[PDB]
Structure 1
Amino acid sequence: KESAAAKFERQHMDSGNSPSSSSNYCNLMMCCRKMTQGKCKPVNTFVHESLADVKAVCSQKKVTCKNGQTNCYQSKSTMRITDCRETGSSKYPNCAYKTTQVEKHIIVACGGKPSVPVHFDASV
């Protein structure tokens, strides 16, 4: 069971960060979205366009998947995204990320009915 001391640190301590930082985004979001549990996910992209716009990519340009499947689609336009990459100093359970604001085309794998994004393949 989590100690009261540890609970206080979790709920109330942020000694290592500035709340006015723009570059702490990946650190917080990777944590929030449960990609720092068990291991640090090394690479992850967050997309800031509307869910409708991202879903629409499944009806856009068919392209090669990095994994050779035939269900990938590239956005017709660039999208506002954030690239999160694990830093060289990052070591689980202290997962540290470089945040990069980018505007690139996204490539997603689509699946299901309706066909919706199920995997983020690449930004190009």
Structure 2
Amino acid sequence: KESAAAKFERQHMDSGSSNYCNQMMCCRKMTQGKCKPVNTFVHESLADVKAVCSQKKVTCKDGQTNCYQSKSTMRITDCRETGSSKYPNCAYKTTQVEKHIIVACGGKPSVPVHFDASV
């Protein structure tokens, strides 16, 4: 089965125009069978992201208490479904911002397993 850690890296990491979300949501499999409504890709280094798991502990949006807020801002891209998006033709809006990210962490070593929010 796909690890939560590898799932997070597939859904959220892209360390490194207007169709960026369209092509990446497709490439990273968030349009297989349904359109992931919203998804964030983080461009900081995988190391900088994993380090968020040793940063400020916050409560996840769902109440789980294994969320971690990043101490510094991060280049991320917000992928949000356009109003026309309708599986099997998922279409997204691409927005780039610099924000702190909140991720959930799990496993040993503790790594990010869910992208919770961007402050």
TM-score (norm 2): 0.86
Deviations 1:84-124 (A, max 9, x none): 00000111101000000010100000000000000000001
CA distance in 1, matches of 2:20, 2:67: 28
Note the C-alpha offset of 1:64.
1.4
Note the C-alpha offset of 1:78.
0.5
- Relative to 1, partners in 2 of residues 1:84 and 1:9: Cα closer, same or farther, differing over 3 Å? closer
User: What is the root-mean-square deviation of aligned Cα atoms in Å?
Assistant: 9.6
CA distance in 1, matches of 2:105, 2:12: 40
- The answer for unaligned runs of 5 or more in structure 1 is 17-21
- The answer for unaligned runs of 5 or more in structure 2 is none
Q: Which has the higher contact order (CA 8 A, sep 6+)?
A: 2
Deviations 1:27-84 (A, max 9, x none): 0000000100100000000000000000000000011110001100000011000000
8 Å contact kept, 2:15–2:46 = no
TM-score (norm 1): 0.83
User: Stretches of 4+ moved more than 4 A in 1?
Assistant: 1-16
CA distance in 1, matches of 2:5, 2:51: 47
Count of residue pairs brought into register by the alignment: 119
- Relative to 1, partners in 2 of residues 1:83 and 1:32: Cα closer, same or farther, differing over 3 Å? same
- Relative to 1, partners in 2 of residues 1:112 and 1:98: Cα closer, same or farther, differing over 3 Å? same
